[PDB]
Nucleic acid binder design. Structure first.
Ligand SMILES: [Mg+2]
Ligand SMILES: [Mg+2]
Ligand SMILES: [Mg+2]
Ligand SMILES: [Mg+2]
Ligand SMILES: [Mg+2]
Ligand SMILES: [Mg+2]
Ligand SMILES: [Mg+2]
Ligand SMILES: [Mg+2]
Ligand SMILES: [Mg+2]
Ligand SMILES: [Mg+2]
Ligand SMILES: [Mg+2]
Ligand SMILES: [Mg+2]
Ligand SMILES: [Mg+2]
Ligand SMILES: [Mg+2]
Ligand SMILES: [Mg+2]
Ligand SMILES: [Mg+2]
Ligand SMILES: [Mg+2]
Lengths: 96, 107, 115, 93, 80
RNA sequence: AAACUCCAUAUAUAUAAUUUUAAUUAUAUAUAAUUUUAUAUUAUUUAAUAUAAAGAAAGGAAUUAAGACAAAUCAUAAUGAUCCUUAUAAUAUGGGUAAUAGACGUGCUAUAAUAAAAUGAUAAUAAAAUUAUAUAAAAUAUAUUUAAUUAUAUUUAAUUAAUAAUAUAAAACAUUUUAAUUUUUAAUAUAUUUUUUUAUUAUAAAUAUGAAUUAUAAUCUGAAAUUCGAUUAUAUGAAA
């Protein structure tokens, strides 16, 4: 490095001025890397899916004419009924 | 080796191998659950020279230098000139093979 | 309180719901909500140039932020099941569950690795 | 089992010939916490001592009137009262 | 915050009230750095199970509070 | 079962304005072999050996049937029966899963000279794969009087990719050094072994192996590193 240091520094400063990028000659912790990091929140939030998705409830709202049957729900209800019948139903919940 | 004795080194090594390599070995057997009756068995060329090499290596390892290559070369020169315990071991092997003459099966 | 597990009323994710999944999802939502703020607080804290009292205050604020603001708290669950081990990011699925889906042909371009 | 130094035959001090044990003692100056010097006779060879923690700087004796050091050294740029006031909310306990 | 810059670790505590009147500080922090501003304050640091009473001397100034509340019991073997 | 299949191989055709170039390539589509032919030598028209001439022609992967082991899984998930419903359901703060007498597997690093360490910029030689929840180049600063190396910080050039980055691959090979080793050194002479020789003097079981264990200081990630994380430096230098 026969070329002088001060001149190189000046050149670097000029380049920094030209572009938006900052010029930190001292090499101090400015905190630039904290803010400059792209925020990843929306992608993280979108992990499990789109919460507004069509459900069986809606398939009654959209098409009242068609008497649909949710099979799993019906099965569950039948199981509950069977439990009630044979004395294995859920105990009544405490309120206090 | 060549430097020590000015004549083709590879040829000399081959000769040494031929000399040292025991032509047969008294291979042990279980022998149908009885006495372990040993038999002389003829050797492949590689096997013959393999036996020789291990002995050569051992005899080299008794020499002084740090570098193994030097030790090896000294040993090879000694064998060319005609001095080793490897020769004695070969002789012993041959004697042991000579005992058990007709233990060979096909004959 | 009684009507909800967490402070804020968040929606349930579609498909497979689980208690752990619910917990994670809410946390992720809160992180998304309060991402910029947290970053700003962090910046204020880790500053040699700024006033020290201000940086201390920022640090205290960061410390006092809840469990659900923390990015580090987020854990990638399986979406089909609710497992949290060997969860592949390219299809948000657990190891066995991924394999099951892959063999069925559910995955967009996945197939047996024959070489 | 019992660790001991086994005794030799004792030397007979004759009656009248017993001499009092005058131990070798130096006149030692103790400067207390403040600049008050006091002379005391002492067996250890040190003409001058200056004390840090004494009665003359203890609150009990005058009611009317290096880990920490290391910490101070390596948290000096921050300058660490105002700081106490900032970081002392007494709601949670 | 371990690194000398950014340090030291600080947590909110009921410090000033303890300083005024000797009321021990029940910490469940265990990762708060001890400071010069609380030497001679009584702390009651959490141990997982039970809060542990400690009077912070001047030798403790650099350390964490959790370092003085040992969580696991001292191991032994039942020689049977 | 074999075969079709995939990878890899050989050949052909197509495409790529040979700056996204690596055409010595990539990728679609074919063809190719579970190779063929002939002379002989043994055993009975064939089958093994050998020889020859024709060919690029030589592997790996996936696929592991029926039954069985009441083999493993109700902790991927789901469901039967059964039990809990102010609790065996739900949330927070900390602790634990990392505890340590002996024991048992798997590994890693070692115990030095057919083997370890310094160095090697017209930068000796690869492949496969990753980079919008990023990959981070050059360069400056400190550790460190030059600088390089290694590690951090400073700050983001380029590219979301046959285009840029991760990334000058490493052993190799070459010079140098290497205690145990008076199998070396350094003072004299010595000389047609001179990075060396000879003579005479003095040079008197763990190292210039190993890297466990610990002390202090820094750095990194994170809101947080005490229990309980990862680096770097200066010391520490067990066992073997
Ligand atoms: Mg995580
Ligand atoms: Mg080209
Ligand atoms: Mg098959
Ligand atoms: Mg089967
Ligand atoms: Mg079973
Ligand atoms: Mg069973
Ligand atoms: Mg069940
Ligand atoms: Mg179970
Ligand atoms: Mg379940
Ligand atoms: Mg509960
Ligand atoms: Mg474990
Ligand atoms: Mg070695
Ligand atoms: Mg190179
Ligand atoms: Mg660089
Ligand atoms: Mg490139
Ligand atoms: Mg060493
Ligand atoms: Mg030892």
């Amino acid at each position: 490095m026969n070329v002088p240091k001060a001149r190189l520094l000046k050149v670097a400063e000029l380049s920094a001025k030209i572009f938006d990028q900052n010029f930190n000659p001292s090499g101090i912790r400015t905190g630039s890397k904290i803010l400059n990091e792209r925020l990843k929140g929306p992608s993280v939030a979108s992990y499990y899916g789109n919460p507004d998705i069509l459900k069986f409830r809606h398939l009654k709202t959209l098409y009242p004419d068609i008497e649909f049957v949710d099979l799993e729900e019906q099965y569950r209800l039948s199981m509950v009924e069977a439990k009630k019948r044979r004395g294995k139903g859920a105990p009544k919940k405490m309120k206090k | 080796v060549y430097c020590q004795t000015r004549q083709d080194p590879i040829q000399a090594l081959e000769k040494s191998l031929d000399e040292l390599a025991p032509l047969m070995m008294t291979k042990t057997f279980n022998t149908g659950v009885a006495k372990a009756s040993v038999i002389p068995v003829p050797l492949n060329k590689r096997q013959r020279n393999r036996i020789a090499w291990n002995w050569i290596v051992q005899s080299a390892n008794q020499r002084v230098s740090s570098d193994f290559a030097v030790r090896l070369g000294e040993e090879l020169t000694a064998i060319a000139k005609g001095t080793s315990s490897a020769f004695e071991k070969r002789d012993q092997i041959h004697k042991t093979a000579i005992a058990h003459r007709a233990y060979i099966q096909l004959k | 309180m009684g009507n909800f597990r967490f402070p804020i009323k968040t929606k349930l994710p579609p498909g497979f719901i689980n208690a752990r999944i619910l917990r994670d999802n809410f946390k992720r939502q809160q992180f998304k909500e309060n991402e910029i703020l947290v970053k700003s607080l962090k910046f204020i804290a880790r500053n040699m140039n700024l006033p020290t009292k201000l940086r201390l205050e920022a640090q205290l604020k960061l410390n006092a932020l809840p469990n659900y603001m923390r990015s580090t708290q987020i854990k990638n669950r399986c979406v089909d099941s609710g497992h949290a081990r060997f969860v592949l990011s390219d299809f948000r699925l657990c190891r066995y569950q991924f394999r099951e889906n892959a063999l069925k042909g559910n995955l967009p371009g996945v197939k047996k690795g024959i070489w | 089992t019992r660790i001991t130094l086994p005794r030799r035959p004792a030397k007979k001090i004759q009656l009248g010939k017993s001499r009092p044990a005058i131990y070798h003692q130096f006149n030692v100056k103790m400067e207390l916490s403040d600049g008050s010097v006091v002379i005391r006779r002492s067996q250890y060879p040190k003409g001058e001592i200056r004390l840090i923690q004494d009665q003359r700087n203890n609150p009990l004796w005058n009611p009317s009137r290096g880990s920490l050091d290391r910490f101070n050294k390596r948290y000096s740029s921050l300058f660490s009262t105002v700081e106490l006031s900032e970081e002392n909310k007494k709601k949670t306990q | 915050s371990r690194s000398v810059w950014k340090g030291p670790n600080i947590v909110p505590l009921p410090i000033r009230e303890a300083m005024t009147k000797g009321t021990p500080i029940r910490t469940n922090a265990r990762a708060a750095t001890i400071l010069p501003q609380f030497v001679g304050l009584k702390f009651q640091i959490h141990n997982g199970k039970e809060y542990v009473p400690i009077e912070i001397s001047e030798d403790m100034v650099g350390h964490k509070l959790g370092e003085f509340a040992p969580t696991r019991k001292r191991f032994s073997y039942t020689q049977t």
